[PDB]
Design a protein around this motif. Structure first.
Motif, PDB file in Angstrom:
ATOM      1  N   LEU A  70       2.337  13.962   6.571  1.00 59.50           N
ATOM      2  CA  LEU A  70       1.786  12.672   6.174  1.00 59.50           C
ATOM      3  C   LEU A  70       2.531  11.580   6.928  1.00 59.50           C
ATOM      4  O   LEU A  70       3.664  11.240   6.581  1.00 59.50           O
ATOM      5  CB  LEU A  70       1.902  12.473   4.673  1.00 59.50           C
ATOM      6  CG  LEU A  70       1.197  11.228   4.172  1.00 59.50           C
ATOM      7  CD1 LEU A  70      -0.268  11.369   4.480  1.00 59.50           C
ATOM      8  CD2 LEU A  70       1.418  11.055   2.696  1.00 59.50           C
ATOM      9  N   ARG A  71       1.900  11.027   7.956  1.00 61.84           N
ATOM     10  CA  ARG A  71       2.493   9.943   8.722  1.00 61.84           C
ATOM     11  C   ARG A  71       1.688   8.660   8.633  1.00 61.84           C
ATOM     12  O   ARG A  71       2.244   7.615   8.285  1.00 61.84           O
ATOM     13  CB  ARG A  71       2.649  10.364  10.185  1.00 61.84           C
ATOM     14  CG  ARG A  71       3.510   9.438  11.005  1.00 61.84           C
ATOM     15  CD  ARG A  71       3.573   9.921  12.441  1.00 61.84           C
ATOM     16  NE  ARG A  71       4.409   9.069  13.277  1.00 61.84           N
ATOM     17  CZ  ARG A  71       5.559   9.452  13.822  1.00 61.84           C
ATOM     18  NH1 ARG A  71       6.011  10.681  13.625  1.00 61.84           N
ATOM     19  NH2 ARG A  71       6.252   8.608  14.572  1.00 61.84           N
ATOM     20  N   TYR A  72       0.396   8.706   8.929  1.00 60.97           N
ATOM     21  CA  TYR A  72      -0.463   7.536   8.895  1.00 60.97           C
ATOM     22  C   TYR A  72      -1.440   7.633   7.735  1.00 60.97           C
ATOM     23  O   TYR A  72      -1.894   8.717   7.374  1.00 60.97           O
ATOM     24  CB  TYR A  72      -1.231   7.375  10.202  1.00 60.97           C
ATOM     25  CG  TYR A  72      -0.350   7.281  11.414  1.00 60.97           C
ATOM     26  CD1 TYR A  72       0.250   6.090  11.766  1.00 60.97           C
ATOM     27  CD2 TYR A  72      -0.118   8.382  12.204  1.00 60.97           C
ATOM     28  CE1 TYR A  72       1.057   6.005  12.873  1.00 60.97           C
ATOM     29  CE2 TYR A  72       0.682   8.305  13.308  1.00 60.97           C
ATOM     30  CZ  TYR A  72       1.269   7.119  13.639  1.00 60.97           C
ATOM     31  OH  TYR A  72       2.071   7.047  14.747  1.00 60.97           O
ATOM     32  N   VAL A  73      -1.769   6.476   7.166  1.00 59.27           N
ATOM     33  CA  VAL A  73      -2.530   6.372   5.930  1.00 59.27           C
ATOM     34  C   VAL A  73      -3.239   5.027   5.961  1.00 59.27           C
ATOM     35  O   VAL A  73      -2.806   4.099   6.639  1.00 59.27           O
ATOM     36  CB  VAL A  73      -1.599   6.502   4.694  1.00 59.27           C
ATOM     37  CG1 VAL A  73      -2.239   5.984   3.432  1.00 59.27           C
ATOM     38  CG2 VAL A  73      -1.203   7.932   4.482  1.00 59.27           C
ATOM     39  N   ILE A  74      -4.349   4.924   5.245  1.00 56.59           N
ATOM     40  CA  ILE A  74      -5.081   3.671   5.137  1.00 56.59           C
ATOM     41  C   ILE A  74      -4.774   3.048   3.786  1.00 56.59           C
ATOM     42  O   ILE A  74      -5.050   3.645   2.742  1.00 56.59           O
ATOM     43  CB  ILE A  74      -6.589   3.883   5.311  1.00 56.59           C
ATOM     44  CG1 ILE A  74      -6.872   4.666   6.590  1.00 56.59           C
ATOM     45  CG2 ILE A  74      -7.299   2.555   5.331  1.00 56.59           C
ATOM     46  CD1 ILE A  74      -6.326   4.027   7.816  1.00 56.59           C
ATOM     47  N   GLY A  77      -7.683  -2.989   1.629  1.00 56.57           N
ATOM     48  CA  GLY A  77      -9.094  -3.140   1.872  1.00 56.57           C
ATOM     49  C   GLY A  77      -9.410  -3.584   3.286  1.00 56.57           C
ATOM     50  O   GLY A  77      -8.541  -3.670   4.152  1.00 56.57           O
ATOM     51  N   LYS A  78     -10.695  -3.846   3.507  1.00 62.54           N
ATOM     52  CA  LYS A  78     -11.202  -4.364   4.773  1.00 62.54           C
ATOM     53  C   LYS A  78     -10.896  -3.430   5.933  1.00 62.54           C
ATOM     54  O   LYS A  78     -10.523  -3.870   7.017  1.00 62.54           O
ATOM     55  CB  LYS A  78     -10.650  -5.758   5.052  1.00 62.54           C
ATOM     56  CG  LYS A  78     -11.330  -6.833   4.267  1.00 62.54           C
ATOM     57  CD  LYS A  78     -10.388  -7.937   3.949  1.00 62.54           C
ATOM     58  CE  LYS A  78     -10.865  -8.692   2.746  1.00 62.54           C
ATOM     59  NZ  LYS A  78     -12.261  -9.147   2.914  1.00 62.54           N
ATOM     60  N   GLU A  79     -11.069  -2.127   5.720  1.00 60.72           N
ATOM     61  CA  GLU A  79     -10.711  -1.191   6.774  1.00 60.72           C
ATOM     62  C   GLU A  79     -11.720  -1.182   7.908  1.00 60.72           C
ATOM     63  O   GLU A  79     -11.380  -0.751   9.012  1.00 60.72           O
ATOM     64  CB  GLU A  79     -10.540   0.219   6.222  1.00 60.72           C
ATOM     65  CG  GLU A  79     -11.808   0.875   5.771  1.00 60.72           C
ATOM     66  CD  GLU A  79     -11.670   2.379   5.679  1.00 60.72           C
ATOM     67  OE1 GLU A  79     -10.656   2.917   6.167  1.00 60.72           O
ATOM     68  OE2 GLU A  79     -12.572   3.028   5.113  1.00 60.72           O
ATOM     69  N   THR A  80     -12.944  -1.647   7.672  1.00 69.31           N
ATOM     70  CA  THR A  80     -13.903  -1.752   8.760  1.00 69.31           C
ATOM     71  C   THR A  80     -13.527  -2.845   9.749  1.00 69.31           C
ATOM     72  O   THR A  80     -13.987  -2.817  10.892  1.00 69.31           O
ATOM     73  CB  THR A  80     -15.302  -1.990   8.203  1.00 69.31           C
ATOM     74  OG1 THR A  80     -16.268  -1.645   9.195  1.00 69.31           O
ATOM     75  CG2 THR A  80     -15.490  -3.430   7.808  1.00 69.31           C
ATOM     76  N   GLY A  84      -5.330  -2.134   7.591  1.00 69.03           N
ATOM     77  CA  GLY A  84      -4.798  -1.178   6.647  1.00 69.03           C
ATOM     78  C   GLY A  84      -4.164   0.063   7.216  1.00 69.03           C
ATOM     79  O   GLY A  84      -3.698   0.895   6.436  1.00 69.03           O
ATOM     80  N   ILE A  85      -4.106   0.234   8.523  1.00 65.19           N
ATOM     81  CA  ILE A  85      -3.476   1.428   9.066  1.00 65.19           C
ATOM     82  C   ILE A  85      -1.968   1.278   8.950  1.00 65.19           C
ATOM     83  O   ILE A  85      -1.392   0.268   9.366  1.00 65.19           O
ATOM     84  CB  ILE A  85      -3.912   1.678  10.513  1.00 65.19           C
ATOM     85  CG1 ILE A  85      -5.428   1.820  10.575  1.00 65.19           C
ATOM     86  CG2 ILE A  85      -3.243   2.919  11.050  1.00 65.19           C
ATOM     87  CD1 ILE A  85      -5.958   1.985  11.955  1.00 65.19           C
ATOM     88  N   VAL A  86      -1.330   2.291   8.380  1.00 60.82           N
ATOM     89  CA  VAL A  86       0.048   2.222   7.921  1.00 60.82           C
ATOM     90  C   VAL A  86       0.760   3.490   8.344  1.00 60.82           C
ATOM     91  O   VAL A  86       0.174   4.575   8.321  1.00 60.82           O
ATOM     92  CB  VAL A  86       0.097   2.032   6.393  1.00 60.82           C
ATOM     93  CG1 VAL A  86       1.420   2.431   5.855  1.00 60.82           C
ATOM     94  CG2 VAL A  86      -0.157   0.596   6.045  1.00 60.82           C
ATOM     95  N   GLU A  87       2.019   3.359   8.737  1.00 57.65           N
ATOM     96  CA  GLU A  87       2.867   4.501   9.032  1.00 57.65           C
ATOM     97  C   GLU A  87       3.904   4.647   7.932  1.00 57.65           C
ATOM     98  O   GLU A  87       4.587   3.681   7.586  1.00 57.65           O
ATOM     99  CB  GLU A  87       3.552   4.342  10.386  1.00 57.65           C
ATOM    100  CG  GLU A  87       4.090   5.634  10.932  1.00 57.65           C
ATOM    101  CD  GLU A  87       5.084   5.429  12.048  1.00 57.65           C
ATOM    102  OE1 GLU A  87       5.583   4.297  12.203  1.00 57.65           O
ATOM    103  OE2 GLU A  87       5.369   6.403  12.774  1.00 57.65           O
ATOM    104  N   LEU A  88       4.018   5.851   7.384  1.00 58.24           N
ATOM    105  CA  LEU A  88       4.987   6.148   6.338  1.00 58.24           C
ATOM    106  C   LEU A  88       6.185   6.843   6.958  1.00 58.24           C
ATOM    107  O   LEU A  88       6.056   7.948   7.489  1.00 58.24           O
ATOM    108  CB  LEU A  88       4.382   7.029   5.253  1.00 58.24           C
ATOM    109  CG  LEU A  88       3.093   6.547   4.609  1.00 58.24           C
ATOM    110  CD1 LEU A  88       2.723   7.476   3.480  1.00 58.24           C
ATOM    111  CD2 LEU A  88       3.252   5.129   4.109  1.00 58.24           C
TER     112      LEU A  88
END
Length: 95
Positions: A70-74, A77-80, A84-88
């Motif tokens: 699990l590295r990247y996650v959304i 909101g407003k992902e279109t 919201g792209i996130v690195e954990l």
RNA sequence: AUUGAAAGUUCAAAGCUUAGAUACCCUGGAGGGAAACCAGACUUAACAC
């Protein structure tokens, strides 16, 4: 690391405030009432959180091979709009 | 064995539309192609005596 009084100002100024509109497809005029503002949190922003887990064994297998891959996650909101792209980054391997 | 457990403020959405760096504006005013300067210097040669 700034003093809090000036730090709040710097940080509140580091946020992105955007105006957005809705345009009628035909005549490229703006539709009546289609005007609003949103706040974003910029790229490179870092949040800190903790995941707490009880002892049960499915927690063990979860933490084993669900969170290692699990590295990247959304988030949010407003992902279109590509928000919201996130690195954990887990603080168990880095530092 | 907690007025608990479970639940993504999410979805759709173009800062666009109209809009001439334009209008007025003399490279002009002042400033002697002047200043200085001798058309002059000097006779020589030859032979005769």
């Amino acid at each position: 690391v700034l003093e809090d009084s000036i730090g709040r100002e710097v940080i509140n100024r580091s946020l992105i405030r955007v105006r957005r509109i809705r345009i009628d497809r035909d005549k490229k005029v703006v539709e009546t009432g289609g005007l609003w503002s949103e706040e974003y949190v910029p790229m490179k922003t870092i949040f800190f959180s903790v995941l707490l887990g009880k002892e049960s064994k499915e927690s063990a297998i979860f933490a084993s091979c669900i969170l290692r891959n699990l590295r990247y996650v959304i988030l949010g909101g407003k992902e279109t709009i590509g928000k919201g792209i996130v690195e954990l980054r887990w603080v168990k391997d880095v530092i």
